[PDB]
Amino acid sequence: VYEGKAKKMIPIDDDKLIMEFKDDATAFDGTKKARFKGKGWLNAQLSVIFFKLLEEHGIKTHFIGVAGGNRLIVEKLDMYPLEVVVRNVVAGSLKKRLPLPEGYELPEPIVELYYKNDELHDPMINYYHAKVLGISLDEIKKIEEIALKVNEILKDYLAKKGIILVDFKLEFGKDKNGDIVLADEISPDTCRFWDAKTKRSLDKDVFRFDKGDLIEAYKEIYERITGEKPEF
Amino acid sequence: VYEGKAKKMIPIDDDKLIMEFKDDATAFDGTKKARFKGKGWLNAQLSVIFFKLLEEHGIKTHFIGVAGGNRLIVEKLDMYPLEVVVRNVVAGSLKKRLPLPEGYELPEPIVELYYKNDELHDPMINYYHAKVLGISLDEIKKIEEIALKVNEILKDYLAKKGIILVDFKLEFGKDKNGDIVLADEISPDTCRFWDAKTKRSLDKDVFRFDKGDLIEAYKEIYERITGEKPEF
Numbered sequence: 001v002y003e004g005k006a007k008k009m010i011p012i013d014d015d016k017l018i019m020e021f022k023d024d025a026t027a028f029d030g031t032k033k034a035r036f037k038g039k040g041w042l043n044a045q046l047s048v049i050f051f052k053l054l055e056e057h058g059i060k061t062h063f064i065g066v067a068g069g070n071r072l073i074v075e076k077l078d079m080y081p082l083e084v085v086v087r088n089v090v091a092g093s094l095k096k097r098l099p100l101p102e103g104y105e106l107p108e109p110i111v112e113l114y115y116k117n118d119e120l121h122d123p124m125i126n127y128y129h130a131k132v133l134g135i136s137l138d139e140i141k142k143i144e145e146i147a148l149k150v151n152e153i154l155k156d157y158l159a160k161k162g163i164i165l166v167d168f169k170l171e172f173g174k175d176k177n178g179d180i181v182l183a184d185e186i187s188p189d190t191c192r193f194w195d196a197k198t199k200r201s202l203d204k205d206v207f208r209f210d211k212g213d214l215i216e217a218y219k220e221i222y223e224r225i226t227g228e229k230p231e232f
Numbered sequence: 233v234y235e236g237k238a239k240k241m242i243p244i245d246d247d248k249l250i251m252e253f254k255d256d257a258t259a260f261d262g263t264k265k266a267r268f269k270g271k272g273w274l275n276a277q278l279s280v281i282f283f284k285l286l287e288e289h290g291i292k293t294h295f296i297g298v299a300g301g302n303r304l305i306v307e308k309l310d311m312y313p314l315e316v317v318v319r320n321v322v323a324g325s326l327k328k329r330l331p332l333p334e335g336y337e338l339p340e341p342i343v344e345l346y347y348k349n350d351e352l353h354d355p356m357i358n359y360y361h362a363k364v365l366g367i368s369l370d371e372i373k374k375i376e377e378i379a380l381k382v383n384e385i386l387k388d389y390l391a392k393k394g395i396i397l398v399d400f401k402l403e404f405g406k407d408k409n410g411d412i413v414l415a416d417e418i419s420p421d422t423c424r425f426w427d428a429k430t431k432r433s434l435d436k437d438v439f440r441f442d443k444g445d446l447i448e449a450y451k452e453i454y455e456r457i458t459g460e461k462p463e464f
């Protein structure tokens with residue numbers, strides 16, 4: 001059993017674990033905390049929907065099944081210590097790296113690699129740093145190739161629903177065959193979603209910058225995507 | 233005429249400029265300042281020596297000639313807005329990016345790209361950011377290829393003189409033929425040099441962290457390399 005900031009990971013046998021989504025939200029290196037009743041359920045459901053879409057499109061993911069409510073059954077992987085960020089529209093930390101305004105449409109997607117390390121506060125890295133960390137160029141290239149394919153699929157699917165995929169974060173691990181498998185979660189916690197018409201945030205930015213009601217925003221995402229009201 | 237933090241750039245015609253090295257030193261985003269009589273002369277002389285060595289090895293540089301003392305004649309270029317850092321041994325900012333100690337010998341060199349932008353304080357970037365900045369992948373790859381070749385040459389040459397090239401920064405621009413040309417300076421200001429036996433700094437780190445006498449350290453570098461005492 002491993003209890004993280006937003007999810008719990010419970011071993012089953014040797015091949016699989018339980019990913020349980022909690023109601024907890026954190027931001028700014030965990031210096032901002034709150035709980036949102038039903039956030040876990042929403043993030044679980046939405047992950048399932050995204051993983052199923054991606055699987056239909058030939059993306060290898062850790063998704064195996066659901067275990068009732070906020071719990072997914074997933075394949076255990078040897079995790080890469082990376083957060084892989086894909087960006088279509090300028091927002092968040094990109095504003096400190098490029099002198100471009102919020103909402104600027106990028107000429108092509110940006111991929112950023114962040115080294116998962118709490119003591120160093122998850123610094124950005126490049127391919128050379130990754131190699132020193134034991135991640136080969138070949139591996140990095142496959143990882144970015146998948147992230148960019150995931151981007152296209154989610155972007156297209158979401159645009160047909162009036163949602164702009166601004167940016168998002170993925171994580172990856174290796175399976176026993178040494179294949180690169182998409183892992184962790186895909187939710188309004190780990191993506192920026194803007195309404196196409198109004199350009200307002202329907203994601204964790206609502207909590208990060210106090211823009212209104214997180215649950216309302218997450219429900220709206222769930223409703224726009226499924227065409228149904230969240231039953232919980 | 234452009235007066236920078238450590239050097240002055242004076243136009244000649246349309247093809248060339250004067251690079252004048254000043255006695256000024258700055259560090260920590262220019263929050264630490266001092267002047268060292270003779271530093272300009274040392275950095276000029278050492279740049280000349282490095283540019284000549286690199287030219288003999290088939291590296292295209294902006295070096296044209298000397299204009300007496302602290303002044304070099306160099307080719308005017310369309311500058312890339314980059315600082316290109318090559319690292320052999322862990323030091324400086326790399327310690328905040330990888331959990332490795334000062335002096336750790338890297339399994340292979342690291343290349344880091346920093347976007348030259350004072351308002352953003354020169355953030356690290358990757359190939360994708362560079363593209364948005366108008367620098368093609370092809371260009372980035374040629375730039376890194378040159379930096380890594382420069383590394384090998386300087387590393388080998390300096391090791392034969394009992395000096396460890398820990399890391400260093402280069403800058404590049406395009407000439408009228410669209411060729412990538414090595415620019416700016418190569419000095420104890422822009423490199424880490426450690427004595428092979430004692431591992432002590434013979435570079436700007438002496439000023440950054442008050443490790444003794446900058447001029448003495450820079451003289452020692454000049455003496456170890458030329459086999460002669462600095463005449464000024």
Ligand SMILES: Nc1ncnc2c1ncn2[C@@H]1O[C@H](COP(=O)(O)OP(=O)(O)OP(=O)(O)O)[C@@H](O)[C@H]1O
Nearest residue numbers: 004005006007009062074075076077079171183184
């Ligand atoms: N298929 C998988 N196999 C093994 N581990 C996984 C898998 N998917 C996700 N994980 C890891 O399980 C954890 C999920 O919990 P959570 O999101 O709360 O992480 P955290 O503890 O907050 O932060 P971190 O784990 O990044 O330090 C993360 O460490 C994630 O990388």
Ligand SMILES: Nc1ncnc2c1ncn2[C@@H]1O[C@H](COP(=O)(O)OP(=O)(O)OP(=O)(O)O)[C@@H](O)[C@H]1O
Nearest residue numbers: 236237238239241294306307308309311403415416
């Ligand atoms: N061959 C060249 N052609 C045109 N410009 C050059 C050439 N070589 C160096 N430069 C530029 O000239 C300037 C040298 O002066 P200096 O080192 O004092 O820069 P700075 O003003 O302190 O900092 P920066 O210029 O990076 O903001 C730098 O801007 C450098 O990029």
Ligand SMILES: Cc1cn([C@H]2C[C@H](O)[C@@H](COP(=O)(O)OP(=O)(O)O)O2)c(=O)[nH]c1=O
Nearest residue numbers: 083091092093094167168169189190191192
């Ligand atoms: C680096 C990182 C990004 N992300 C997601 C949130 C955003 O949708 C996108 C880019 O985030 P970014 O703008 O880099 O950081 P911040 O969340 O501090 O503004 O990736 C995470 O969920 N976790 C992370 O650790």
Ligand SMILES: Cc1cn([C@H]2C[C@H](O)[C@@H](COP(=O)(O)OP(=O)(O)O)O2)c(=O)[nH]c1=O
Nearest residue numbers: 315323324325326399400401421422423424
């Ligand atoms: C980024 C940068 C590096 N360098 C040189 C100094 C070091 O020899 C090497 C790596 O520096 P780095 O460790 O990144 O930064 P700091 O100088 O703040 O410790 O590159 C510069 O001269 N100017 C620069 O703007």
